[PDB]
Scaffold this motif. Structure first.
Motif, PDB file in Angstrom:
ATOM      1  N   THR A   1       0.841  -1.191   0.000  1.00 35.17           N
ATOM      2  CA  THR A   1       0.000   0.000   0.000  1.00 35.17           C
ATOM      3  C   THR A   1       0.877   1.243   0.000  1.00 35.17           C
ATOM      4  OG1 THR A   1      -0.156  -0.261   2.388  1.00 35.17           O
ATOM      5  CG2 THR A   1      -1.971  -1.060   1.057  1.00 35.17           C
ATOM      6  N   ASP A   2       2.137   1.028   0.379  1.00 35.83           N
ATOM      7  CA  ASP A   2       3.186   2.044   0.309  1.00 35.83           C
ATOM      8  C   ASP A   2       3.911   2.069  -1.027  1.00 35.83           C
ATOM      9  OD1 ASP A   2       4.548   4.109   1.875  1.00 35.83           O
ATOM     10  OD2 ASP A   2       6.343   2.905   1.544  1.00 35.83           O
ATOM     11  N   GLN A   3       3.832   3.206  -1.702  1.00 35.41           N
ATOM     12  CA  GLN A   3       4.591   3.446  -2.912  1.00 35.41           C
ATOM     13  C   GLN A   3       5.206   4.831  -2.828  1.00 35.41           C
ATOM     14  OE1 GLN A   3       5.235   1.193  -5.271  1.00 35.41           O
ATOM     15  NE2 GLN A   3       4.045  -0.270  -4.052  1.00 35.41           N
ATOM     16  N   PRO A   4       6.487   4.938  -3.152  1.00 40.79           N
ATOM     17  CA  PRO A   4       7.116   6.269  -3.270  1.00 40.79           C
ATOM     18  C   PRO A   4       6.549   7.067  -4.452  1.00 40.79           C
ATOM     19  CG  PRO A   4       8.758   4.636  -2.668  1.00 40.79           C
ATOM     20  CD  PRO A   4       7.482   3.873  -2.942  1.00 40.79           C
ATOM     21  N   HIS A   5       5.951   8.237  -4.211  1.00 41.01           N
ATOM     22  CA  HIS A   5       5.063   8.885  -5.205  1.00 41.01           C
ATOM     23  C   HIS A   5       5.225  10.407  -5.360  1.00 41.01           C
ATOM     24  CE1 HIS A   5       2.917   8.791  -1.351  1.00 41.01           C
ATOM     25  NE2 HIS A   5       2.322   9.904  -1.742  1.00 41.01           N
ATOM     26  N   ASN A   6       4.746  10.991  -6.468  1.00 39.86           N
ATOM     27  CA  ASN A   6       5.045  12.405  -6.695  1.00 39.86           C
ATOM     28  C   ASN A   6       4.021  13.409  -6.166  1.00 39.86           C
ATOM     29  OD1 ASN A   6       7.220  13.932  -7.536  1.00 39.86           O
ATOM     30  ND2 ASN A   6       7.090  13.291  -9.683  1.00 39.86           N
ATOM     31  N   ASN A   7       3.082  12.973  -5.351  1.00 38.70           N
ATOM     32  CA  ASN A   7       1.761  13.542  -5.364  1.00 38.70           C
ATOM     33  C   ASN A   7       2.006  15.013  -5.152  1.00 38.70           C
ATOM     34  OD1 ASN A   7      -0.994  13.458  -5.597  1.00 38.70           O
ATOM     35  ND2 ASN A   7      -1.345  12.253  -3.736  1.00 38.70           N
TER      36      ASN A   7
ATOM     37  N   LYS B   1      -1.457   0.871  -9.756  1.00 37.16           N
ATOM     38  CA  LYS B   1      -2.457  -0.048 -10.286  1.00 37.16           C
ATOM     39  C   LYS B   1      -1.929  -1.481 -10.311  1.00 37.16           C
ATOM     40  CE  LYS B   1      -3.780   1.230 -14.178  1.00 37.16           C
ATOM     41  NZ  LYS B   1      -4.883   1.947 -14.896  1.00 37.16           N
ATOM     42  N   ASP B   2      -0.651  -1.641 -10.644  1.00 32.10           N
ATOM     43  CA  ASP B   2      -0.030  -2.950 -10.559  1.00 32.10           C
ATOM     44  C   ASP B   2       0.247  -3.299  -9.105  1.00 32.10           C
ATOM     45  OD1 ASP B   2      -0.200  -3.296 -13.251  1.00 32.10           O
ATOM     46  OD2 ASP B   2       1.936  -2.941 -13.671  1.00 32.10           O
ATOM     47  N   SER B   3       0.005  -2.343  -8.218  1.00 29.53           N
ATOM     48  CA  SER B   3      -0.056  -2.653  -6.805  1.00 29.53           C
ATOM     49  C   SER B   3      -1.503  -2.894  -6.428  1.00 29.53           C
ATOM     50  CB  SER B   3       0.546  -1.536  -5.968  1.00 29.53           C
ATOM     51  OG  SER B   3       1.931  -1.751  -5.786  1.00 29.53           O
TER      52      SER B   3
ATOM     53  N   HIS C   1      -2.089  -6.519  -7.702  1.00 24.42           N
ATOM     54  CA  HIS C   1      -1.283  -7.353  -6.829  1.00 24.42           C
ATOM     55  C   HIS C   1      -2.073  -7.529  -5.550  1.00 24.42           C
ATOM     56  CE1 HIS C   1       2.739  -8.015  -4.460  1.00 24.42           C
ATOM     57  NE2 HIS C   1       1.976  -9.092  -4.500  1.00 24.42           N
ATOM     58  N   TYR C   2      -2.627  -6.424  -5.064  1.00 26.21           N
ATOM     59  CA  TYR C   2      -3.464  -6.432  -3.875  1.00 26.21           C
ATOM     60  C   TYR C   2      -4.629  -7.401  -4.002  1.00 26.21           C
ATOM     61  CZ  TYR C   2      -5.860  -4.741   0.267  1.00 26.21           C
ATOM     62  OH  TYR C   2      -6.449  -4.656   1.507  1.00 26.21           O
ATOM     63  N   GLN C   3      -5.295  -7.402  -5.143  1.00 31.54           N
ATOM     64  CA  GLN C   3      -6.499  -8.193  -5.280  1.00 31.54           C
ATOM     65  C   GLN C   3      -6.121  -9.635  -4.996  1.00 31.54           C
ATOM     66  OE1 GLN C   3      -8.831  -7.645  -8.901  1.00 31.54           O
ATOM     67  NE2 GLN C   3      -9.381  -9.822  -8.909  1.00 31.54           N
ATOM     68  N   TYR C   4      -4.921 -10.017  -5.416  1.00 29.68           N
ATOM     69  CA  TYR C   4      -4.503 -11.405  -5.323  1.00 29.68           C
ATOM     70  C   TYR C   4      -4.002 -11.775  -3.943  1.00 29.68           C
ATOM     71  CZ  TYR C   4      -5.290 -12.753 -10.048  1.00 29.68           C
ATOM     72  OH  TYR C   4      -5.897 -13.108 -11.228  1.00 29.68           O
ATOM     73  N   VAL C   5      -3.189 -10.908  -3.350  1.00 33.95           N
ATOM     74  CA  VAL C   5      -2.641 -11.176  -2.026  1.00 33.95           C
ATOM     75  C   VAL C   5      -3.767 -11.291  -1.004  1.00 33.95           C
ATOM     76  CG1 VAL C   5      -1.206 -10.310  -0.153  1.00 33.95           C
ATOM     77  CG2 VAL C   5      -0.478  -9.999  -2.529  1.00 33.95           C
ATOM     78  N   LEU C   6      -4.765 -10.424  -1.134  1.00 34.93           N
ATOM     79  CA  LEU C   6      -5.938 -10.462  -0.272  1.00 34.93           C
ATOM     80  C   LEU C   6      -6.803 -11.710  -0.431  1.00 34.93           C
ATOM     81  CD1 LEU C   6      -7.820  -8.921   1.726  1.00 34.93           C
ATOM     82  CD2 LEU C   6      -8.890  -7.894  -0.286  1.00 34.93           C
ATOM     83  N   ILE C   7      -6.959 -12.200  -1.658  1.00 31.42           N
ATOM     84  CA  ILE C   7      -7.827 -13.350  -1.909  1.00 31.42           C
ATOM     85  C   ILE C   7      -7.453 -14.566  -1.067  1.00 31.42           C
ATOM     86  CG2 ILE C   7      -8.318 -15.164  -3.582  1.00 31.42           C
ATOM     87  CD1 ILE C   7     -10.171 -12.910  -3.824  1.00 31.42           C
TER      88      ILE C   7
END
Lengths: 175, 175, 175, 175, 175, 175, 175, 175, 175, 175, 175
Positions: free
Chosen positions: H113-119, H138-140, H143-149
């Motif tokens: 859920t942590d990504q280094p970002h430009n916001n 989005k590729d996180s 990835h999330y959808q799968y790790v959670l399942i």
């Protein structure tokens, strides 16, 4: 209201009142008086889009076209006063059952007529020191034409004691 | 109204009133008096598009061209007064049955004539300190020409007691 | 309130009060009086978006449409006063159970109506020395149309003593 | 406060007071009175974003909705006064246990409402000699909508003596 | 509707009603009144492709050209009123049986006339600041010419009591 | 709903209720009222593709065309009220059994009508400062024509007590 | 919840509770109430893809459609209240067993509806100073159509005491 | 916490405590309360990817869903309070044993859920003076959808005293 | 259908029904009504190869030209209604027996008309930015000419009760 | 399903059930209802090759044309309801036995219709910025013509109780 | 699972358990429930090759179609509940023995569906700035057609207690 017919005699057996009355299709759902619905409809007919206070009317008339079941045990379903064939008869009390579907639609008009607007530019440059615009008004104006059409079009079930009595197996004790 | 013929005698047997009357095609649906419909039609003829209050008329006349069934048990279907062949006769009471289809169309005119508009620019630069435009008005003006044409064109069923009596097997008790 | 029926007699056995009452679905969760809910709904109907103080109403009415359980042991679930078939009856006390789901939605309206806004530009150039804008207002205006629709649409369970008594196996001691 | 029930009798054995009370989940953690929590919630409902002093309220109400354990040995857990079935009963003292999680969230609102702001431009050009802006306010306004929703949504454990007594094996000596 | 002939006498023996009526070819399948079908057909004749609301008509007329079986036990198949050779006769009630095949085709027109379209470019550059195109419209326009042709071409079975009675061995009890 | 016929008498023996009722083909599967299905169908007829809120209708009507079994032991399968041959008869309550197959198809329409879309470009350059496109709409528009056709085409089994009783060997105890 | 039937009597022998209950297929696995599942399904029906907060609903409804076993020893499996054949019956409490398979799928929808998105470009150039795009939305929109279809399609086992009792050899002691 | 059951009696013989408890599979490894795990899971359900502070939640909830062994000699494994068959029972304390495998996975979400970002470009050109981008998000997101399942899918062993006692040969001295 | 003649009397002895009816040449094999076959044939006559939806017709008409045996014990083989020499006669019900051979051929047309095709190039370069080709269409077009010829050419056995009765030694009991 | 005839009486002696039923040719092998098989066949007739979702149908219809043995001891082989010669008869329940051979062939169609394909080029150059090709589709299209032909051609054994009873020496005990 | 029948009585003599059970053909080898195998098969039927997540299904369904022996001493082989001839019977628990051969084949499908692929070119030039190709997909698509065929074709041994008991000389002690 719809108020009307009064406490006395008694009573819906009330063994069936809850099984078949408060359980659903009652309280949850509106009843609109006929010959009371008919003039409301033209009330909406019936509106210019827009000058305010010609849209303030839609919002109001939904309230005060009073819209509730004609009976509560103790009291009887709205009925006929007097015998047939005589000068005092005044028999027909009538009711439109409004679907859950209709009401949701009815509120649709309720906030068809509300749009967040700038009108409060008439005051700064017009009363002190350009043009108003309508596309939000107008795509609500035409949306209106359509939402209103179906209300007239679709028939809604008429009810009466000969009928609300047969319709749900509920009956009114003599004593 | 259509009001007219009064309580007395009695009565539609009312064994058939609900089976065949309030059930459908009645209350739900309009009745328009003939020779009352004919002048309304020219009322719409009959309008300039547009200066306001020449469009406020459409909206109004739909109301007050009174449009309801000629009878309620107790009361009789509108009928002839007096015998044939005599100075007092004044026999013909007539009624156009309006289809569900028609009414929906009739409201179509009802908000043919309403357009959300800027007119309230006459006041700021004209009364204090450019041109009005009509394409919205005019494609409603011509839409109008067409919606109105069909109302005159299509024949609508005429009704009378010789006929409303035969039409639904309902009859009026003597005593 | 909902207050009403008073301390006396006694009492819910209270052997079951906590097992089945304070444990959940009670205190945690709202009860809204019917015929009290019905007018609130039109209260929201029912609002223009926006001039302030026409949005200050949403916020308020959520409070003061009083929304709590009809009983506390000692006191009885709201009930009928008097016997059936008589002039003094006034029997029906009614209650809508509000889902956890609903309340969360209800607050949704609660701060549908709040938007951080500039209005405090009317005062500097208008009262001393341009136009207001509405997109934030309007996408809240329409959001509103939708959030409100479901509140009317979705039926909520009606409750009464014949019912709140059966519903949870709790009973009221005579002495 | 929560103060209330007074010193007397005595006492929690206090052999278990520290083993099971001051050790954790007590002092460290809040208790919020019910029917005291319920009105606070609407206190927050309940706020416009923003004019100052409508945000000064959030900050304050967190204080003074008094939020501490109902007992200290010597004193008893808040309890019922009087016997069941009688006019003086007034039995139910209730308490929401607030998770460590909740409080951290609760302060989240506490400084949801604080934003470093320019407002002190109203004074230089407005009272002596442009527009205010809201994006910081508004992304706090909506953040607010969400942080508040969960507080109502999530149920929090109700406590009472029948329960705080069973809940931790602590008991109150007679003499 | 087709409504018409009323409850009375009784009744189709109903020993055969379900064996031979609700089982198939009834309810499942349409009945269209003749001299009611004939004008509908020209209603479709009868349309320009396209300006909207000249295609909104197809969609509508499929509804409200009312299309259901002339009888329900209790009630009789639509019949002749009065004896032969007399001024009041008005005998012929007629009905087109619509094949399952036809209806499927009939809806084909129903969404012949619907095309997802850009028309909402008249508004941006025309009312504020290129050409519309028709190939989707036109290959629906000609598709239309063909789908419509077969409806007129193909004869559909006429029915009447002398015939609906012989057609399925069902008969109407005297008492 | 389908609600209707009320608790009383009793009861399906319930020795067979679960063996033959809740086990399958019941609860799991829909029942749609006839003469209630017929107007829904034209409801879908019946839609323009697309302006939004003309697609919001599909989604809604699937709900609120109420679609559940006519009976629960205790209560009887929906039945006829009154004897044959008399003015009050109103006999025919009818039901379409919907296959598992149909429902899956029915939802197919349910999200035929939903497409992720840009429409929210009308607002930025049109209301502030190019063309909309339809291929996604249109290959859903035609997909629609086909999915809808089969719903009308395919006959679905009609049910009634003479029939739901024979259909599964379940019977209703007298006392 | 599913809460409901209360502590009393006692009890599942609990010699078998763990051997056959907490061991597997219980706690680990969901139970969804019927007639509670049925409206959820249409809740999902039932969503536009996409405007946010029309996708925030999927995420929420998975919570609060409360989904847990109907019993805990001590307490009984949800059951019928009252005897057969009487006005107060209200017998049928029903439950869908959800496979491990289903839940995993159910969360699939749970984050079907979440996509990392740019929407926060409406604010910089639209509110200060191009087009939004949907392919990520739409291949989730259609993915959705498919994931949802199977939930309706596949039948899930119905459970009741006559059944949860037979299903696992567990029985409820009288005293 | 998991805290709960208190010091008293005594004690696990502690001849076996270290041989079989602190040695492994204890302290080293988590215990998660059931009916405490179940709501956490939906807590994660349950998150939008992304607006910050909707990802700050994952990180937090891993802490404060308190996750430790139910006992320390002296103190007993969490147990049932009261006898069977009575209003005060509240028996079931439950625990999910978390594999070493799971925790490692659980942290996987922790820094899914942590990504280094430009916001922190919203601030320079947006608040002073282009578009944000999401592929890392989005590729996180997926990835999330799968790790959670897998967390929902995979069953985790339930524990209780009847069971934690049998599971490791450890027993609790009377005196 | 072919439906028609109804249950009554009874019955084919049914001692021979299975020996000589369901065993073969029945159910397995089609029956096509004459004067119903004759117009179908021209339906196929009768098609252009190709524009789609002129080939969609072949596929459909094979269904809905209803094609099944005229009788089921109980019910009689389709027969004559009324006596000879009178205005109501309408005697001749006729049937073509279709060989196993024919049907296989009939489906041959069924997917004569289906070809996997590129047509979906009209859309990319024609509506956005070469020629279509027909050899697959045309060698199916001519194949068609031949497959169709034999259907008209070859005579198929006509059947009637005077004949289906003699044809298989099956007879219809009086009582 | 095929479900149908219900538990009662009892029972296949079950001395022979396994010797002659579960051993082979049962469970292992399909049963397809007639007059249920006949419409499926035209379902496949019946498909265009190809636009997707016109091939998604083959795959589906193999499921949900429900295909299992008409009996399980306890329950009887599907049978006739009522006596011969009477209005309620509805006698013929029919079944096609499907060879092991057929099913393998039936799946052959099942993945006749699946081809790994590029279609996802419509989206990159057509919606953003050549021709589709069909030889894989078409040699599956014609393969289809042939695989389908044999299904209609080859007769499959019809079964009934007069027959499934004689066919395997199994009989149904009276008591 | 297959779980089911519970601990009690006891027990397989266990003198023979290891000689004849854990030794081979047990644990080592799968058991698949019938009427549980049958729907799985169509689950695979049943898949498009390919869009991902239509191949992710094969991989998953092999897990969670739970596949283990119906008994462990202590517990009995899955059996019939209740006596013959009665409403509660629900007798038939059935099991397919899967050969070592089958499983190896079953995994063959398991990684039929996995192919190392480029799909992650949709993202670089399609979402930023040619065609996908299928031969690897398709020679797996057809390989699939064949591997799947044999699973349906080949019969697998059915087992039950009358049979698993006879099959290996193992018997269940009374006390």
């Amino acid at each position: 209201n719809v108020s009307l017919t009064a406490k006395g005699g008694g009573h819906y057996i009330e063994d069936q009142w809850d099984t078949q009355v408060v359980e659903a299709g009652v309280f949850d759902d509106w009843w609109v008086h006929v010959e009371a619905w008919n003039k409301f409809l033209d009330n909406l007919r019936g509106i210019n889009f827009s000058v305010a206070s010609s849209r303030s009317q839609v919002a109001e008339y939904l309230a005060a076209l009073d819209r509730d079941l004609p009976a509560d045990v103790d009291r009887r379903f709205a009925g006929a006063r007097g015998q047939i064939g005589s000068p005092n008869y005044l028999p027909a009390p009538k009711f439109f059952r409004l679907d859950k579907r209709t009401i949701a639609e009815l509120t649709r008009l309720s906030r068809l007529t509300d749009q967040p607007h700038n009108n409060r530019d008439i005051e700064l440059n017009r009363a002190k020191r350009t043009l108003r615009d309508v596309q939000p008004l107008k795509d609500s104006a035409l949306h209106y034409q359509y939402v209103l059409i179906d209300l007239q079009s679709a028939r809604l079930p008429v009810y009466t004691r000969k009928t609300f009595e047969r319709e749900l197996a509920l009956e009114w004790i003599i004593p």
